[PDB]
Design a protein around this ligand. Structure first.
Ligand code: MG
Ligand code: MG
Ligand code: MG
Ligand code: MG
Ligand code: MG
Ligand code: MG
Ligand code: MG
Ligand code: MG
Ligand code: MG
Ligand code: MG
Ligand code: MG
Ligand code: MG
Ligand code: MG
Ligand code: MG
Lengths: 317, 317, 317, 317, 317
């Protein structure tokens, strides 16, 4: 096929072209299996070439140049053509530390990925915090139906972000743990064992590579703790939501039971009113002191039975 | 008994026959304990023979041939006779890497198992996603009864798939961790310490075996993260289902309580209508301005008591 | 006190007797602290003697004999007198592998314990599967009261079985990890450094002991995964049970609310029927076109209010 | 200040006195930072002195004596003056193993703490088992209100006990893992490099110290599994309690809905009875075959509507 | 920019000033990347300087002085100017241990952070305990709405505190695990390899640094267990809250069902009273022994049906 290559030289100059994969393997001195890019996160060195893939960002770091592959249709235009050249050129920062190009390229790629991981968390966190805050207030019998889908979607994005940080840390820690892997990153040292050793002023050794990789492992470790705390907060907030729903359930069920007692009291003493309303000879239809006596009994009796019933639920706490 | 053997030579030729287990041990130079195949996942080397079992796939890799055992009644016909010979023959790919037959056979077997593990996840994931998506919508008082059995069955298949990936990774990592185990896989090297060493051009050494095994450990590690995220999503979606069920429970319980208040108001003020309907002398049956006054009181009184009761639940939030 | 000893010689002959603990220490060349048997799972070697305890099975493996202690009232009669002698005698299997008696005794004891652990799971699994299957069907408002106690008891037995497998694996892995511990198991080698070394044909070395112990670690590892999946299935099934109970709760609560609306509609429009049934002058008792008009209003009005109320809950989704 | 010291010599003699902390540091050859006792669990050796703290038990093991500090108001009277002297004196047990005083003192202190940890579990376990057993029976609509506080308190004590076992195991495993730490416990060896080496009969070496410490690590490991299983059982029992509560909730809700259907049927067909009871001209008050016809319709119609409604919930499963 | 520096010399004298970052790098012999302070918890040594950050506390420990950076608007006035000088001066404590300034500065900084971590837990624990205690009492149908927000906020602060302790332990354990990292803390040793070695009386070696760092790892380990137990107690208490809410839900639902049975009984037998109240010829309006017979049937029949219905729910347990 073809690889859309954006090539940065040691001076930060940007050249973009297109080359066949078969010809690129010979030009880079690699094989077809080296540039398969079939791992979502991987930082490997194959024949003096640093091959890194971070999700959509596939790059190869050569002794003298940095190549970005498959840079189209991925919003890799502002960083690639305006921010990346400045970092690779070495301008500013410190002029007393002329580190090799591999250190500048590895730092630029690692910094870029830690920025997208940080940016993803800086967007998820306000969304989850604002959705959980209004879902957890104990002032409603129910919850917002639409905002539960937001929490479900944002929780899924949080778990995918947690994996992205986790596999970023594993890739860096794999190189840090093994000294041979860490030494392989010093690409210019092996390309020129004599020219690079001439400037033996501590420009790049095992310490400088370890310091660079440990810096981004700790930055990603900060992301892991912040993303893990957010996931813990989601679980804690949902448990408070469950107590809120089941507490107002009991409040409405107590009011319903109190009103049920009142309707039973009226029905119990309204039965004698219904009984005395039948069109049968009650032998009392002529008395003038029976209607008001029964009417008083029904109203007072309903009140007394209601008061007695209300103490029944109070007895049941 | 007998072993149904499908034998592939160094040229990919397929020969199928049947041999007694006792005779196969002598032919292979093995013992009865070596070919017990009592472990669901195992990759061991016994006397210059690579013995691998992956669930139903049992294979022995010899210096010059690959044997597949118990290949019947397992749908091992398309891969065995059409896809496996092409991979073992070495055609295509790279003609500049004449790797030994053991590397080709190990890669073909490891690739096949990572494809079935990937295929199992590629089927479970859409089924779980589509069942969870329609179970979680907050537009129904209840959930689909039949689709809960689908989620239960698919969740069980997901946990069995998670174990299959987990024990696949452990088997590969066991060989990767120990250099002696990794060196044992170089079967042709030990069979011919001089003939194999003649082609000392980096065809097969500790790096090539490590690169092959690390490739499939990372492919299975990708499967572990994808299957673990799916299990996390199931738990997150069920918690949202619980909030949905308990929120509409509170909505229906609030409507029921509001209607209960209305029926109590009618019953409370309908008692005086029942009282005035008895066949007793009320001393008011002749007045012409008492019927409409009481009728108005009952209807207005029911409304006022209902309005007062509705504020009672509003006071209870 | 006394130890009920069942002694098996190198030929598998069974002798049972009773000896005092104090005399047994001198006969075995051990101490009182060595045979305390105070650990539920332990495989230790003390002065050229392999001392193993597996729950109720306490055994000491000597250079020339195997002793089983406290074999009474534990159903250790079929295995001890019919199955164990055959395995220790070395008959069958392979006649070309004259392994020492310690290998035969360790294998027989380890095989026996992996069989009881497998048998315990082969009984728990059908019981849990059949109880969960009928508890999870979404065709009942509630669950079987009696079968919840079965699940509680079987879940407790599953967790105790999980610990039995876990501590069995730890005991084997402790010996496997340390080469000195693994070498101590070669009891006959240290008893006869010259006689055993005479048959230097690979009968028993570090590989044969490691292969035997790794075989039973992997068999127990299979048990751990099967028992862990069952525990995961219990948790998954209970969550589906909770959704089933809370979905039929909402179905019955929706039917109750729909019938509550119908009774309120009848009560609301039955109040005018009660109002017109009082024994007061309504100034309409003589008209012939008022009774049927009011009766129609009550029945039609109840229907219209019921239809309007039914749309109210539909508005609330 | 002052330290309340209970001193045991090599013969088990008990002497109790009080000494200032400043003078005790010089007498013991220690510093103020060594005897801070600010760690709840700690077993450290500082200048040939074994300093151990186990919650309230603070002890210093010297070459020739064992000192217990802060032994007042802690029920340390029966063990200190009646049980501890017997163990330290070396009487009974084995007279052929004249182990140094440090081994006897370490064993006595470690045995005492494993007894209090075992005793705490032997009290919690029956309390939790008896509370869970009667809370889980499916014969009550609710649970015992008072016994939920017992489970909450006993669960809190179980988690504190789990930490006590966990940090006891970590303290022992720290010494076991490092050989230098294990060698420091041989206090008499370093105090008298020549006198102790004279009795080179295996009285105390790296094996005897390792055997003593591994014995109590495994005893505490047994406690960890028993306490962990109890915590798992609490969680399993509570989930069964939730199913019990939500199953009888559905049973009472089905009975209430069935009775609600019956009251609606009476109200629906009682409306025509109320309609025919108004004091309006119905044009049917003179017929003799209308009263019983309507009365039959109301009673039969209520039954038919009730039967039809009962099938409605049966349709909803 | 500028760094607000509070400088403490070897005598504890406090000097506060303001210096530009660029000039401070040259004065301290460091680089811009060394003082980035972009890690929430970090204890690193860069060119004979101990650089530590603990949340808001950023400090650099030099051979002869301790510098605190960004000390404004953080309540760092009482500790900085009244408590810190006393600890750094070396007054009191022990005059026989003239440890270097780095040991005094590291101890003062580590002690300060363990005090703020302890103080945060000493505030959270009473707040959570008092909120959980009154939320868990089984004497209310519901829970306090306002106190659920307190538990949610305090649970979030507890999880952030748990991370603060966790990363404090990781930072200390990283130095403890690696001897080279631990040796780098001995700043005065490398600054003066001969002057420091002159006082070879055990003032500061690998043991003294290890003892200081292990002391604060164990103090933070105590905090981890106390904060972890509190989080476990929150989860246990919430599960008891759920049982309390669902038990009183069943109690109120049983009372409501018992009263529903009573109202159905009155409605069932009140239908014959309504039937006999219609203005139709019942052919019984003249009999004198029919009114009281029907009235008795309605009242007795309601009681008998109610008693029969009450046994129905008793049959359903
Ligand atoms: Mg992801
Ligand atoms: Mg490698
Ligand atoms: Mg499986
Ligand atoms: Mg091996
Ligand atoms: Mg109700
Ligand atoms: Mg009613
Ligand atoms: Mg057990
Ligand atoms: Mg050992
Ligand atoms: Mg009337
Ligand atoms: Mg504790
Ligand atoms: Mg140490
Ligand atoms: Mg934090
Ligand atoms: Mg380092
Ligand atoms: Mg519930």
């Amino acid at each position: 096929p073809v690889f859309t290559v954006t090539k940065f030289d040691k001076q930060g100059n940007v050249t973009s072209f297109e080359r066949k994969k078969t010809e690129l393997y010979q030009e880079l001195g690699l094989q077809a299996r080296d540039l398969r890019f079939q791992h979502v996160m991987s930082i490997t060195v194959r024949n003096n070439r640093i091959i890194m893939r971070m999700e959509y960002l596939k790059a190869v770091i050569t002794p003298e140049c940095l190549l970005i592959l498959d840079y189209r249709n991925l919003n890799l235009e502002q960083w690639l053509f305006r921010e990346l050249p400045s970092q690779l050129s070495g301008e500013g920062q410190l002029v007393t530390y002329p580190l090799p190009f591999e250190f500048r390229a590895i730092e630029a790629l690692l910094q870029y990925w830690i920025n997208t991981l940080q940016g993803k968390l800086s967007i998820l966190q306000p969304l989850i915090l604002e959705t959980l805050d209004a879902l957890v207030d104990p002032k409603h019998s129910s919850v917002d139906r639409s905002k539960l889908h937001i929490l479900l979607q944002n929780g899924k994005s949080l778990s995918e972000l947690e994996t992205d940080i986790k596999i970023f840390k594993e890739s860096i820690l794999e190189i840090l743990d093994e000294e041979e892997l860490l030494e392989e990153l010093c690409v210019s040292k092996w390309s020129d064992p004599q020219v690079f050793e001439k400037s033996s002023a501590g420009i790049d050794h095992a310490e400088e590579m370890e310091l660079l990789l440990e810096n981004y492992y700790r930055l990603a470790d900060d992301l892991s703790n912040a993303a893990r705390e957010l996931r813990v907060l989601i679980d804690d907030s949902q448990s408070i939501i469950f107590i809120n729903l089941d507490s107002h359930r009991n409040v409405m069920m107590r009011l319903n039971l109190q009103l049920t007692m009142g309707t039973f009291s009226l029905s119990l003493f309204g039965l004698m009113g219904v009984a005395f309303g039948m069109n049968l000879e009650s032998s009392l239809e002529e008395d003038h002191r029976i209607f008001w006596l029964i009417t008083g009994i029904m109203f007072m009796g309903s009140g007394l039975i209601w008061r007695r019933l209300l103490s029944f639920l109070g007895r049941q706490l």
